[PDB]
Amino acid sequence: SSFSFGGFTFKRTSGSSIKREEEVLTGNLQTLKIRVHEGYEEFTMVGKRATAILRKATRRLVQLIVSGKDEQSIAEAIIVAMVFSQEDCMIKAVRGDLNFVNLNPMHQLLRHFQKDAKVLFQNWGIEHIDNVMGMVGVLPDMTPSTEMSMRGIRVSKM
């Protein structure tokens, strides 16, 4: 039950989901039809330069604990996780001139945020983090922080 998305192998740990073909509205008010997965699932993301534990619900990321080679490798894994979550704020982060989508829309969403994750990370939201050791918060500019992180995202040492 393993699959590939954005260079990462995905394996389901726990949970289940059914698919619903659904219409979503971008920040540019454009209609995309995506195959939404309903239900709470846990995944391990395995890539060549990053690994992650992804806890998600229907169109909502619950938690992402990401480990990797450096900031860039980790950012790549966070981008895939946020696109994979199917969250409204990731879809609403598709905005502005030429930013349009033409055939799988999930792969288009990824290409878009791979080019520039600034609006995605900044529009995702930030939260206060209870102190933990060996786990750190990460800001939308990919700066480590003990005080705050992007909603549900934690960075763990390799």
Ligand X SMILES: O=C(O)[C@H]1[C@H]2CC[C@H](CC2)[C@@H]1Nc1nc(-c2c[nH]c3ncc(F)cc23)ncc1F
Least gap, CB of 16 to ligand X (angstroms): 9
Selected binder of ligand X within 68, 76, 82, 84 (CB under 6 A) = 84
Question: Closest CB to ligand X among 21 and 141?
Answer: 21
Within 16-134, strands assigned E span 18-25, 31-38, 41-46, 50-57, 60-68, 126-128
Q: Which is nearer to ligand X, 85 or 149 (CB)?
A: 85
For 54-73, letters b (16+ CB in 10 Å) and e give bbbeebebeebebbbeeeeb
| Cα distance between the two ends of the chain | 26
Q: Which residue has the tokens 């239900």?
A: 39
- Sole binder of ligand X in the list 7, 9, 17, 142 (CB under 6 A): 17
Count, residues near ligand X per rule CB under 6 A = 10
Interface map 30-69 toward ligand X (x if CB under 6 A): -----x-x---x----------------------------
Does 13 interact with ligand X (rule: CB under 6 A)? no
Q: CA 107 from chain center: how many Å?
A: 13
Residue among 35 and 111 whose Cβ is closer to ligand X:
35
Contact 140, 127 (CB under 8 A): no
Residues that bind ligand X (CB under 6 A): 3, 5, 17, 35, 37, 41, 84, 86, 104, 106
